[PDB]
Amino acid sequence: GAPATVTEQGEDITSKKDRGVLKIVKRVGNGEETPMIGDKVYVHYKGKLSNGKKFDSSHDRNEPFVFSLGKGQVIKAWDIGVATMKKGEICHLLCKPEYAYGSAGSLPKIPSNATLFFEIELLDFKGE
Ligand SMILES: CC[C@H]1CCCC[C@]1(O)C(=O)C(=O)N1CCCC[C@H]1C(=O)O[C@H](CCc1ccc(OC)c(OC)c1)c1cccc(OCC(=O)O)c1
Numbered sequence: 001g002a003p004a005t006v007t008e009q010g011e012d013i014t015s016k017k018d019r020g021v022l023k024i025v026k027r028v029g030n031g032e033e034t035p036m037i038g039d040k041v042y043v044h045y046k047g048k049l050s051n052g053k054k055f056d057s058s059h060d061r062n063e064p065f066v067f068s069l070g071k072g073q074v075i076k077a078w079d080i081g082v083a084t085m086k087k088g089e090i091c092h093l094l095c096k097p098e099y100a101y102g103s104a105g106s107l108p109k110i111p112s113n114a115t116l117f118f119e120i121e122l123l124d125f126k127g128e
Helices: 002-009 076-082
Strands: 021-027 040-049 054-057 065-068 090-095 116-126
Touching: 002 021, 002 090, 002 116, 021 076, 076 090, 076 116
Parallel strands: none
Antiparallel strands: 021 090, 040 054, 040 065, 040 116, 090 116
């Protein structure tokens, strides 16, 4: 499925090139530039365990997820990934536990040492 496609075809977007965060652009965004650090970003996402089991989706509450980019308000893979996106883009990310919830996890739904799949749609962003 989609996780396996990222494993097989994904671009390594980490600074360390350790395959910790892998990305495929699924829909090219029409936006010109990536958001700046600090900007308010508006996203819709689907989150799955590596095995494909759904754990959360913003589409279940019909509400975009909103955070400030690059401020450590979310897991490291998200700060890394969203920073590479343009407005309107949908990407798939595969995130090793070092760049997500590590040995601690996010219990009960996310276990220790989980590799996570996310589809992120960058709906919009506004300058810090
Ligand atoms: C099973 C995970 C669910 C649980 C219900 C809320 C969303 C959820 O956390 C999720 O789907 C998720 O895994 N997210 C949410 C979308 C952004 C990516 C990821 C996330 O970073 O969530 C943070 C978790 C807290 C966090 C923050 C910073 C971290 O590193 C610096 C970090 O590392 C382990 C962990 C998040 C942020 C804000 C709100 C939130 O949940 C809603 C709430 O608390 O009101 C969850």
